[PDB]
Amino acid sequence: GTKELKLKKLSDNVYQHISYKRVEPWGLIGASGLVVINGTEAHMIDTPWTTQGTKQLIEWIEAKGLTIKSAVVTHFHEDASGDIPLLNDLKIKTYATSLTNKLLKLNQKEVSSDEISSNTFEFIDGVASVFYPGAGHTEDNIVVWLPNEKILFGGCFVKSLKNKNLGYTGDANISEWPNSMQKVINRYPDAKLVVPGHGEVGDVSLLKHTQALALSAAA
Numbered sequence: 148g149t150k151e152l153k154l155k156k157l158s159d160n161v162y163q164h165i166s167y168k169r170v171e172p173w174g175l176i177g178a179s180g181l182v183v184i185n186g187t188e189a190h191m192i193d194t195p196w197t198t199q200g201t202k203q204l205i206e207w208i209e210a211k212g213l214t215i216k217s218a219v220v221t222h223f224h225e226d227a228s229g230d231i232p233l234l235n236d237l238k239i240k241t242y243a244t245s246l247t248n249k250l251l252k253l254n255q256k257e258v259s260s261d262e263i264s265s266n267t268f269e270f271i272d273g274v275a276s277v278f279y280p281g282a283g284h285t286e287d288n289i290v291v292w293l294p295n296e297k298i299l300f301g302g303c304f305v306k307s308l309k310n311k312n313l314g315y316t317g318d319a320n321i322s323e324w325p326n327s328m329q330k331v332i333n334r335y336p337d338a339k340l341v342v343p344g345h346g347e348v349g350d351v352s353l354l355k356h357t358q359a360l361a362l363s364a365a366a
């Protein structure tokens with residue numbers, strides 16, 4: 148791929164989009180979202196981190212002859228909801244919870260076109276399920292479950308195994324994060340792949356590892 152956007156196949160219908168941003172002192176580092184393909188229809192889980200990443204993603208999807216039906220953003224930060232304004236211009240439906248829209252509005256950013264007003268939401272009929280586990284990385288963070296592939300998109304609610312801390316905690320509830328994670332652990336014992344917002348894909352250990360990081364940071 149390019150220095151802005153890499154795509155990695157996770158299964159027949161599911162791609163991981165990895166978008167890059169310069170964050171000193173690490174150089175270029177990736178944010179992960181998904182593309183889910185349902186027949187002639189494509190769906191974005193999180194927007195890429197840069198507007199350029201997003202335009203390259205739209206081109207790569209539309210170059211397969213797929214219509215981008217919808218996008219769901221997993222929290223109010225730029226590495227998940229950064230290109231809500233572009234998608235809304237292109238008349239691609241954006242989905243965000245009422246909590247995500249509250250925090251976008253509070254930070255003077257455009258809200259989603261469509262509001263999720265439930266703790267569980269069927270983002271793509273029989274293909275993608277949204278769950279709100281409670282506060283963790285942010286008040287508003289959600290996870291996305293792909294029942295056909297047994298893929299859980301954790302976003303920034305979930306840390307990579309290698310990560311030894313929680314990253315940016317300025318909007319975090321470190322006290323609730325372990326109880327929130329226990330809900331996700333209890334809901335998805337069948338998860339084969341967990342996608343963190345940053346770093347390597349893994350198994351359920353990533354859930355238990357994030358819970359442990361959070362339990363220790365309270366000390």
Ligand SMILES: C[C@@H]1[C@H]([C@H](C(=O)O)[C@@H](C)O)N=C(C(=O)O)[C@H]1S[C@@H]1CN[C@H](C(=O)N(C)C)C1
Nearest residue numbers: 170173176224225226303313314315344345346
């Ligand atoms: C500041 C970041 C980024 C921010 C965030 O989502 O809080 C984003 C808004 O810039 N996501 C974050 C997080 O805490 O999850 C942080 S860490 C970032 C992603 N992985 C890299 C990392 O921590 N490495 C060890 C390479 C840098």
Ligand SMILES: [Zn+2]
Nearest residue numbers: 222224284303
């Ligand atoms: Zn974040």
Ligand SMILES: [Zn+2]
Nearest residue numbers: 226303344345
């Ligand atoms: Zn992040």
